[PDB]
Design a protein around this nucleic acid. Structure first.
Ligand code: ZN
Lengths: 86, 113, 100, 50
RNA sequence: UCUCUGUUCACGGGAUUGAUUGGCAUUAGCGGCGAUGAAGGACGUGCAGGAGGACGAUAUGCGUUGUUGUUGUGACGG
RNA sequence: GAAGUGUGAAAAGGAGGAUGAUGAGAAAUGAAAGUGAAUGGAGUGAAUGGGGGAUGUUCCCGCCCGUCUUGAAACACGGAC
RNA sequence: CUGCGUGAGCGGGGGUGGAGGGGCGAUAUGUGCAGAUCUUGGUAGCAGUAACAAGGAAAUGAUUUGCGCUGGACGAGGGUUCCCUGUGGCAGGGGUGAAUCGACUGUGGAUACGGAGGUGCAUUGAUAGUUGUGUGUAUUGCGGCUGGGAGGCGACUUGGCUGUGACGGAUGGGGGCGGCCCUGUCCAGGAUAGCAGAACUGGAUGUCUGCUGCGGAUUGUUAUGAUGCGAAGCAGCGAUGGGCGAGCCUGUUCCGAUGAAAAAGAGGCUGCUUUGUCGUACCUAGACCGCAUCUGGUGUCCACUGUUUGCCGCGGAAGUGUUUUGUGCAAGGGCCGUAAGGGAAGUCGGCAAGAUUGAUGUGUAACUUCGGGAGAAGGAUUGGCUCUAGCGUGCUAGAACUGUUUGUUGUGGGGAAUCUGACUGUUUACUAAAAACAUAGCUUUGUGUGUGGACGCAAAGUGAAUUCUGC
RNA sequence: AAAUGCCUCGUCAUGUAAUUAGUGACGCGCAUGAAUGGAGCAACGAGAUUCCCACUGUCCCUACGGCCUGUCUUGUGAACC
RNA sequence: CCAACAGGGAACGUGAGCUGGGUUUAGACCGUCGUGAGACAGGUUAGUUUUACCCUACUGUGUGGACUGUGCAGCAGAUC
RNA sequence: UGUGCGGAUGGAGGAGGAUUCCGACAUUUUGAGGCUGUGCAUU
C-alpha cells in the first residue's frame, strides 16, 4: 500500500511564505529558507546555472538605481533651491 | 420554478424535513412570488403550505407479548440464548438476600427477641 | 431537520471540556459547558477533610471574603483542629525540659 | 478553513479580484475587438498554493 | 451496391515562394549601487479595468524649462 | 520549463442558411499523406514491374529492400504512411 | 499538358497566383537522403469495433405512488464554490459585525496541556455564544461612606488573607444529565367493508464521607473491617408515580514502570466610566490527496426502535438521495440453488464444498511441570396454550392439554500418532508469516568512575523448566 | 537410513486385496554427538507429515433451474499492432 | 478383471487449452568443504502462470419457387 | 394441492354472581376452497 493509498495521508504543510524572497520555502521546524537562506545576513549561493538569471540585478524594478544613473550624466547637480548652500 | 426556495425557507421555519411539506397544487401563482420569511409565514396560516405527519411505530403487539411472559409464556429451554448468569447475575441475587436478612436481625434485637 | 444536538467549540474530551445535555424552554437539545472540577481541602498532616473551605478554581477563589477562604484559628487555612492541639502541647512541654 | 492567518487572507483576496474578463466597454471599441482575458483560473483545475 | 483504377470539382493539412520594429558576431568608448537605508520581495493606485507595462497615499503621475493644441511629448528636479 | 508572426492601399464588411453589398481581388500563397460527390472502364485473380505490342488483360521474363556475413526471399534484425 | 538529354537535369504552353526573378566567369560553403527501436508535426487501416451510460411509473408533473442508505457538527486541506437578478454556462450586483468564541500571554515546545468573564428568547435572501432584548458575571479608571472587633465549652459563625495551579492503569459498591420504557388522570390527531372491556399515535400533568461535646464498651460491610491512641447511643456543627446509567461520591488492588513544568491572591457597601488587534461566507467527500465527477486513503464528537447475553447479525423510523418511450433473455462466461444409487474409487495432496454450532441436566481417559489436559470424547432435552410452587417479583423449578413428528427460523468438526519451535509477541509496504527474529532463564568477559559509584554501567554467546554438559 | 545414510525403493515386523508412503526395531554412522549445545513433548501453534469416524457433485456421469453479462437498439466513442 | 489388456510417430503432438507435484532468482534449516565472504547433479520446507476485438483454418448461419434426375464427398457397428 | 371464511356444538383449566367472561386447538356445514400455459365448445 505504498502507492495510491499512501497519498491520502499528505495533509500537513511544512513551509510558509518567506519574508525575504516570497517563495513557499521557509521551513518552520528548521527556521530556515531553502531558496535564499534567510535569516543569514547574506543571500544563498544559487543551486544551478539558470538560477542565477532568474533573480538578479535587473529582474525587478530598480526604483533607485535608474534615478542615480540619470544624475551621473549631468554631474550630480541637486535641487536648485539648496544649490546656494553648496 | 420557485419550488427550491420555498422548501428551503419553509423547512427552517417549521423545523422538519423537505419532503414532509405539502404545496397546494392549485395556487401556483401565490407560491411563485413569496421570496421572504414573512410571506412564507402567511401561506402557512392560509393552509397553502401544510406539514405532513411522521410514522410512529405502534407498540400494541409488543405490549401483549410483555404481559404474557409476566405469566411465564415464552421462557422455556428453547427460548434462552444467554447463560443463566448473563440474564440474572448471581452476585446481585446474593446482595439482595443478605441485605434483607441483615435487616430482620437488626429489629429482632431492637424488640427484645 | 428534526432531532439534532447543538454543540459549540471543540469536541475533544479533556478535563477542561466537560458538557451536560439540557432541554431548553423552546424544545432544543444543547451540549452545555460545565465548570472545571475542584477538589476538597485536606489537612497537610493527617489528610483529614476541612469541610468548610470553598471548592473553587484559583481565580474565583481569590475573589471571596476571608470567611470563605479559611477557618478562624491559627493555621486555619491548612491544618486540622486535632493536629493543632498536639502541636501546642508539644511546643510547651519542650521548653520545660530546657529550662531544667 | 474558517481559521486562517492575516497574511493568508489578504493574498486570497488579491487573487480573487483578478479572476475577471475584459470589461465590455473596452471590447466594443474598434481596435480591441476579438480580445479575451485568457489569464483565467478555475478552482478545480489549478491550485493557488496558499 | 461493394473492391481496384482514370478524369473533373469540393474538402483535409500547413510544406513551398516572398516579407521581418527579432536574433547572432566583430570593432570603438564607458564600467556610473548601499546606514543620505541598496538590489530583491509583498500589497496597493484609473469616473467607467482583467493581463502586461507604467506608478507610490504628492500612486494609470506632480514642479521647472523647451516644443506644442495634441490620446500631447523631450530634457532635468522632487 | 514550452507552444503560438501576415484581411485590405483604405473598414470601405462580413461571421446559421438563402438573397445580396463593397473592393483591382472575398482576401497572403496553399504541396503531399488521406477523404467526399459525379462520371468512364475493369474484377471474384493478392497487387505492383520489365521486354514486345496496344484506347485494361491474353505470349515471355520477374520472391522485399537496407544491413552483418563463407552464405539471405528467409522460421536473422530495422522499416504503417 | 508537352519538347530536348545515355543520365544527373534543363525548356515551352493553358489555368491559378499578385511581386519580383535570372544567364556567364572567378570566389566563399551549415552544399544534394528511403533507412539511424532517427527528431518534430500531420494523417490512415483497425472500427462506428472494445469500453461506458440508458435509475420504478402515472398525456400533464410545486400533485399521487414505488425503491436505496449514510444522517448532523469541530479541525487539516480547498478558496468565493455562498445569496439575488438576467440569461444559453456565463454576465452584473450583494453578503462574513465579539469584554463574556480561538489566537495575540505560560512553560528550554503547543489552534487538544495551564488559564480574569453566560445563559435564555426573538430576528436576514445570505452572519450570529458577534445583531436586538430579559437577566447575570468579570474588568479599566474616577469618586463617596465605612471598620481593626463581637460571638460559641467545642466543631465553627462573621468586612476579619498566604491558599491553589498540580496530575497513572484495572476493578467493586452507592447515586444519576439526557434519552427510552411501564402506569393514573386530562386535552387532542389519523385511518377504517364487519366485529373489537372502549384499540393505536401525540401532548400536558403525578440524605450522611466527615468533624465536635457528653458517654465509657462494644460495632459493621457486596467484600477487606473499625474500636481504651476512646465503640455504640444521645445532642450539635458542617456538607449536600415506578426503573434501566454518563460526569459525581466512597473502597480495594497492580509496578526493578510510582504516573510534567511555569504564569496567575488578596478582601466590605455603593456611584459614574472603559474594554485594543487578527480570524468568522460556504464544502466528509461530485468543493481534500490519489493527473479525473477515480469502488482506494483521511484526526475528533452526537445519533431512535422489535428480537437477543450482545451498540453484532436479521428487520423497521427520522433525516437524506432518486427516474418516467433500449431488449427479454442461443452457445460460452461471473456469482449461486437442488439432485436417484454409491461414498475419496477423484487428486501431488479431501483443494473446493458438505458437515458441527445457542442454552440447560448428564457423563468425562491417557498423560502431566499438579496448575492443567477439558466445552475432552460420548449421550439426552427444547414450540404453543392453560395453571401450580419459591422469594429476590423477575427469574428459577414442576404438571395437564394440543398439532399432519416438530420447534436454536444465528453462533466449535472430532479422535490416534511422528518431526519441529518452550509459551503471549515481531518480519520481506507490492510473489516467502515460517522451523527465521525476539523473549525469560543459563554462562563468560571488561571496568574504582561518567550527572550515574560494582545488587552499578558496558560488550559477546546459548535460548523455558527437568536431566546432563566427556577427553 | 531422523529436516543429518552415498550405496538405497538398506534388512526384519506392522497397517492394505495390492505400501518408493507412515510407525516400531536393528547399527562400522560416505559425512551423528554434547551452551557449534546432547537427550527430552506437559502446555501452546492459520507450522510440516500419516491414519480413523463423520460428511458430501471431488469423482462414476452428468442433468435442470435463478440473477448479472453475452446476443439485439440508441448515445458517447479508444488502444495494441 | 479381461477376447486381449502389442509397440511406436505427429516441434521428445498438445501451457494466449488447464494444472503447477518435478525443476523452480530473492527467506530459512541440516550434513560435508572453506580462515573468511561463500560452495555442493547432497537432503528439507515457504515461494505472482499476462494479452485475441485482426488475417487464415475450422463449426454453424446467410447468399430469392414446386417436383425430381445424377456426379462428387462423407460413411458404423464390433466383441463376448 | 388438500378440507376455505363465517356460524353452530365442544375444550386442559382460570376468573367470580351474569349462569357471565378469557382459552391453544377439536368436530361439523365441506373430497371443500384455490389454481392451470393442456384438449373441446362458444362469443
Ligand atoms: Zn527566502
Amino acid at each position: 500500500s505504498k502507492g495510491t493509498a499512501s497519498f491520502g495521508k499528505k495533509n500537513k504543510r511544512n513551509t510558509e511564505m518567506c519574508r525575504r524572497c516570497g517563495r513557499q520555502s521557509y521551513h518552520k521546524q528548521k527556521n530556515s529558507c531553502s531558496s535564499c537562506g534567510y535569516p543569514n545576513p547574506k543571500m544563498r549561493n544559487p543551486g544551478s546555472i539558470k538560477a542565477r538569471r532568474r533573480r538578479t540585478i535587473g529582474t525587478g524594478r530598480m526604483r533607485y538605481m535608474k534615478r542615480e544613473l540619470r544624475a551621473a550624466k549631468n554631474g550630480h547637480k541637486g535641487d536648485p533651491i539648496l544649490r546656494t548652500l553648496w | 420554478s420557485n419550488e427550491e426556495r420555498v422548501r428551503r425557507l419553509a423547512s427552517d421555519i417549521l423545523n422538519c424535513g423537505k419532503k414532509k411539506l405539502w404545496l397546494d397544487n392549485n395556487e401556483i401563482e401565490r407560491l411563485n412570488g413569496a421570496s421572504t420569511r414573512e410571506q412564507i409565514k402567511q401561506l402557512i396560516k392560509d393552509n397553502v403550505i401544510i406539514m405532513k405527519q411522521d410514522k410512529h411505530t405502534s407498540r400494541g403487539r409488543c405490549r401483549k407479548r410483555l404481559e404474557a411472559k409476566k405469566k411465564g409464556r415464552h421462557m422455556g429451554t428453547g427460548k434462552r440464548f444467554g447463560t443463566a448468569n448473563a440474564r440474572m447475575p448471581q452476585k446481585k441475587i446474593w446482595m439482595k438476600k443478605i441485605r434483607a436478612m441483615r435487616a430482620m436481625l437488626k429489629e429482632m434485637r431492637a424488640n427484645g427477641e | 431537520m428534526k432531532n439534532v444536538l447543538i454543540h459549540k467549540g471543540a469536541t475533544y474530551k479533556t478535563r477542561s471540556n466537560r458538557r451536560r445535555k439540557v432541554r431548553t424552554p423552546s424544545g432544543k437539545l444543547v451540549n452545555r459547558r460545565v465548570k472545571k472540577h475542584s477538589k476538597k481541602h485536606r489537612c497537610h498532616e493527617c489528610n483529614a477533610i476541612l469541610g468548610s473551605i470553598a471548592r473553587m478554581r484559583p481565580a474565583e477563589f481569590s475573589r471571596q471574603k476571608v470567611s470563605a477562604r479559611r477557618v478562624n484559628r491559627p493555621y486555619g487555612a491548612t491544618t486540622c483542629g486535632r493536629c493543632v492541639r498536639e502541636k501546642i502541647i508539644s511546643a510547651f512541654l519542650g521548653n520545660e525540659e530546657r529550662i531544667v | 478553513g474558517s481559521r486562517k492567518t492575516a497574511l493568508v487572507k489578504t493574498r486570497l483576496m488579491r487573487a480573487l479580484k483578478r479572476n475577471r474578463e475584459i470589461p465590455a466597454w473596452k471590447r466594443m471599441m474598434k481596435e480591441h475587438k476579438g480580445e479575451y482575458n485568457r489569464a483565467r483560473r478555475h478552482w478545480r483545475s489549478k491550485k493557488l498554493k496558499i
